[PDB]
Every structure is written in structure tokens, then in C-alpha cells.
Amino acid sequence: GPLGSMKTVFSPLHSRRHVKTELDGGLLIEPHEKPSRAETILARVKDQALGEILEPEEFGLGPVKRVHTADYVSFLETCWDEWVAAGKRGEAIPTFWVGRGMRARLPKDIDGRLGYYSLGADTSISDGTWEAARASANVALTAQKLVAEGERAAFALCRPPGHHAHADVFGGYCFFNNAAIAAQAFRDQGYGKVAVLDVDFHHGNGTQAIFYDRSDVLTISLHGDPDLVFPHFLGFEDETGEGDGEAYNLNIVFPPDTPFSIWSQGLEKACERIRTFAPDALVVALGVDTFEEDPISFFKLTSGDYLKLGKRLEQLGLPTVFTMEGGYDVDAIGVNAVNVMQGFEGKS
Amino acid sequence: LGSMKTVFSPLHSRRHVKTELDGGLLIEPHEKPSRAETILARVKDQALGEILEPEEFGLGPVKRVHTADYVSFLETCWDEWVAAGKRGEAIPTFWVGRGMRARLPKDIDGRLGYYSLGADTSISDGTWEAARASANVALTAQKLVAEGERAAFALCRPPGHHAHADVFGGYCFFNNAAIAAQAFRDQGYGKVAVLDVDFHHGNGTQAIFYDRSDVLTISLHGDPDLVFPHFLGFEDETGEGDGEAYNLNIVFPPDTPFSIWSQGLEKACERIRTFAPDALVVALGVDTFEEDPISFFKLTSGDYLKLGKRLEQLGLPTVFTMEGGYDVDAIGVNAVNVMQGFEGKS
Ligand SMILES: [K+]
Ligand SMILES: [K+]
Ligand SMILES: [K+]
Ligand SMILES: [K+]
Ligand SMILES: [Mg+2]
Ligand SMILES: [Mg+2]
Ligand SMILES: [Mg+2]
Ligand SMILES: [Zn+2]
Ligand SMILES: [Zn+2]
């Protein structure tokens, strides 16, 4: 496509995930991660003529299982059917989990397995969750293929998001780690080193965990202080990797009310870390829940700041896949996410 | 025929939560105040023995079992929850998933998950007061036995046996049975056995004494592959370190009746005989009952008389702590039948 354009991959199958309940503050509420998020971004991609929009190819479970365990993939496929067959009347929500002092032992019971495979209770599973998660991973893999076959960049309009999912744990509205799947696909195709930069408001705990003992995939996240927000139990600045991965994970933490003038100092530190890592490809886990009107987050970026973010990311000079993560003010989510892509393409 | 004293606190009614997460829905809680009131009414109706209010022992004996940080959390959780703007009862949303750090966070939601093993045990106003009262009920029962009674009935509510040193869940906050067992040890009883006949595994009691040989922990329960607590309670868990061979789990499948369950009871009694303890704590649940709404054994009301009789034959100073049992219209008959069987009713 012409200079100033970027392709977007989008699957209509995201609408197969449309849960009705989310545990929040002790109540079952309307979920934050709703289908209109993807539809609003897509409409803005079309309205601004960002570039070609294409549906994903089907890559099968192979590339997903380069990152996720077979038992976990099997669990996600059967969980809903087993839940209904066991007589439960609500959506599939964990009630019990492996508390501190208990065994990490897989039980037969579906409630037990729900808790074994989860890190939170705000991510209901229902009919179509499996199909939407599969399509979202294929969206990311199709974007990776576009870039591997010649595009400078591509936008993977993933829903559900991915960066909170571990090799065998779901939560934070995520099931398959689309960013990690794209990064591993780059590695499997002969890209020697890959960086994953997580600019979503929340820590990419799943991505950090998946590559934690590796030096061939650099993981960086900017996020709200986990002492104060999800995911609470990872994301601290003292987590720098393990074994061969020591010095190849970087967390940058910010307090409530942080604006772009401060957040972008952390962005500059992340970009300098990417420069010294010198990767062959970049995956950006993009959330716009850093926005000043986001209902669940406490940074203060403006819509115009997303143009600046995209410009700065283009200056890294790397083949780049963007995977859509969070962002919950639906009025502005399309403007904000597409502003990143437009800034990358030279707008403003 | 014989008499047994019962300790009961009216402060149990301070815990009266409205919601329990169950099957993806917020339902009426199973662990409800009428459980304790129905048992107490039957204790009075049968003239089992004197009924006493608990003494206030303070937090010393509780902190012999539970960590100071956990005890502090339980006192402030509800106030912090309300001040943070939450509109429901206090229920964990996130926890330490496999692969995350066991690191205590500042946030109240984060601490709720750190200190819990499940989301079915809502916290609200008065939970702290009722949990403190329930531990005092167990400690008063232990005092009665140490001062000469053969046995005493601690009519605890909330129950206790699923609580670890620093984890609440399964309707439990303080491990009343563990607190009573440790009180026996602290008063010079060299060996103590804790026998858990509740339908569910006493995972908290197991964890608290797991590396210890001075407190023998035995539980009969439904197979954790199939029921709470799922991640402890298996027969291969026999202890750790010096505690090796001082934990015994006996597991049964759905539909198990007393004629089979009592064979496991006999194996537990033989292990207790060779251990030869100086005191016995029985974590007593009657959710082994054939009509219990969340459990799958098939004991009848008359079987609880036989259970009480068999426990008396151990010949030990015995504290009964009330745990589960959720078929309310039979809970009084069932629980008091254990005490009356202990005293000689058949
Ligand atoms: K982030
Ligand atoms: K790494
Ligand atoms: K038991
Ligand atoms: K033990
Ligand atoms: Mg179950
Ligand atoms: Mg919070
Ligand atoms: Mg009944
Ligand atoms: Zn986010
Ligand atoms: Zn029970």
C-alpha cells in the first residue's frame, strides 16, 4: 500500500465472545471487555482509510501451542461444555483456586480445573469463548505473516486481548497470549531476536512469564504500579528475568495521575533498551487504557498523545506488529487506537 | 444419659452475609446463622448439659496458629473495602495464580486474593467479631476439658478447618480446631490428635501441623478430585520432614454410606490408638448427611449416634468443634446425636 498506510487484520468471530457477567466489587456487572470495543476501532480504521482490512487465515493450534501448554489448550476447548454438563446455571467463573500452601495438582472436577487454570474471577467463559480466542490468535498470526512477507507494520485488531495469559493460565480478560504467539512465530521463522513492548496500562504478566528465562525475546512493560492495580503479583521493577533471561525483562512502573509528559520518559527508557537489544522484529502489545477517561485505569494520556506514541515507535525502525489489548472508554477507543497507527504512519 | 457442656456465643449472628458466589451466580449463602440456632435449640431441648458463653482469651492463642499479618488483615478488610468504594460484599476477584509471586500488595483487592483460597466466603460487617467469638468458643471448650470435663462441645460459627495460618476460605477464617489443639500443647499436653469427620478435607488443619509430629492430623472426606478443597486432601499426603507419617487422609467416593465410611473411621481410630495422644480434638461436620445440599455421602441421622459412641471409646479428653452441615432441618438432630451417642444414647 502507499506510504502512510497500514493494513489491519480483523475477525468478525470476535463477536462469538459476548459474556453477560463480570465479577467486580462483589457484584456481577456488565463486562468491560465488550464487543463494541472492536467494532468501534474497526469503524475508525475504515473511516480514516488507514489501509486494507483483511480477515485472518487459519493457522491451527500449532503456533498457539508453541507458547501455551497442550493441557491448557484442551481445557479451553472443553471448559464450557463441561460446565453446562455439570449443572451450573451461570457463566463459567472460578470459585476456588490453588491457594498459598496447596498443591499445584490438576483435579478431575471442572470447578477445580477452572481455578487451576486461572488467576482471577472477572473473566467469565461462555459459549463462543473458545472460537473467539482462536480467531484472535489467528488475527495476530496473520498480522505477523503480513510483516514477515514485506509490510513494515500491521495492526492485529485482536479481541479478546492476550497479554495477561500465561502458558497455562487465563485471566485479565485474556486467554491466548496473542503478542507472545506473534513473537514466537517471528522466532520460528528465523528472526534471531524479538522485542515485545507492552504499552497497555496494565503489566503484561503473561508475556513476561512466557519468556522470563530467555534472552532471545526481550519483554518490556510500562504500567500502573501493581501494588495498586491488577495484576498485583507481578510487574515490579525488581523482576529482571531468571537464568539465561536475566537482564532481558524490564518493568517500568508509574503512580496514579501520570500524564504523557512523565510516561514518555519511561517510553524513552524502553526505546533505549530496545536499541541496545537490537531485535530483528518488534511486537507492540497496544492498550489505550492509559487514556485519561479510562474507567478502570489511572493514567492521563490524551487522544493526541497517541499520535506521538505512534510516531516514537516508528522511529525505532523495526518490522512491527501491533496487537490490541485493553482500552475501555468506548467513545474514544477508536480515535485513540487508530491515532497510534496514524502517528506511526506520519500523521500530525 | 451422661451430660456434656456446650459453649455458644450469640455473637455468631454478627456474620450474616447475603451473597455467595456459586456456579457463576450470587446465591443465598449455605453457611447461615440458622445452622447454629437450630443446633442450640436441640441442645436445650435434649437437656444435653449446661450451656456457657465463651470467655475472652484475646488474640494470643489465635496467633499461636495464625500469622500476625493475617489477623490484622481480617480486622481491617471490611473497612478498607468500603473506603475503597466497593458496593458489594468483600469477595476476591484476583489471586496469586500459578507463576506469580507470593508478594503482599498494598491494594485491598490484592490482599483479599493473597489471603484467600476461594471466592465463596464473602466478608462483611461483623465477620471479624463473629470469627473472634468462634475462636473463643473453641478455647473455652478446651479450658473446660483441661479443667476436668471429659468432653465439651464448641458450637462454633463460623467454622474453622479450611483456614490455613494465613489463608481464609471454605466459610472459615480462624482454625478453631487447630487453635484448640495448640492450646492443649501449650498447656503441657505432649501429644494431640485432630480427627476431622466433616465431609470435606480439613486442609487448613493439615497445613498448619504438616511438618510436625506432636499433632497427628487425620481427615475422612470426599475425594478432592471431585470436591472442595481440590488441591489438598489426597491419600499420598502423609506429612513433611519430621511430620512424615503424622498426617492421614482417608478418601471416599460419591454415595458412600456409614457401613463403608465407618471402616475408614476404624482405621483412623487405630492410628490414634498407636499415636496415644493426651487430648483429642474432633472437627465435627454433619455434612456427611444423606440430604446435605453440597456433599455426597449417605449417613443417616441414626449413624451420628454410632459415631459419637465410637469416639467415646477412644477414651480421651475430647473437644468437639462444629464445622460444616447444611441441611438445616436435620442439623440439630444430627449434631446433637453425636454428643448424645458420646454420652451413651443408642
Ligand atoms: K503495559
Ligand atoms: K525475556
Ligand atoms: K474431614
Ligand atoms: K502433623
Ligand atoms: Mg465441582
Ligand atoms: Mg483495587
Ligand atoms: Mg432435610
Ligand atoms: Zn490494560
Ligand atoms: Zn464440610
CATH topology of chain A: Arginase, Chain A
The rounded Rg of chain A comes to 19 Å
Ligands, deduplicated: potassium ion, magnesium ion, zinc ion
Most residues in contact: chain pair? A-B, 57 and 57 residues
Spell out the CATH superfamily of chain A: Histone deacetylase domain
Describe the oligomeric state of these chains in a short phrase: homodimer
Number of strands of chain A: 10
How many alpha or pi helices of chain A?
Answer: 9
Shape of chain A: globular
Spatial arrangement of strands, main beta sheet of chain A: 4-1-5-10-9-6-7-8
Q: What distance lies between the first and last C-alpha atoms of chain A, to the nearest angstrom?
A: 20 Å
Order of helices and strands of chain A: EEEHEHHHEHEHEEHEHEH
Percent in strands of chain A: 5-15%
Binding site for Mg(2+) 2 (chain A): 293
Family (chain A): Belongs to the histone deacetylase family.
Pfam families (chain A): Hist_deacetyl (PF00850)
Organism (chain A): Marinobacter subterrani
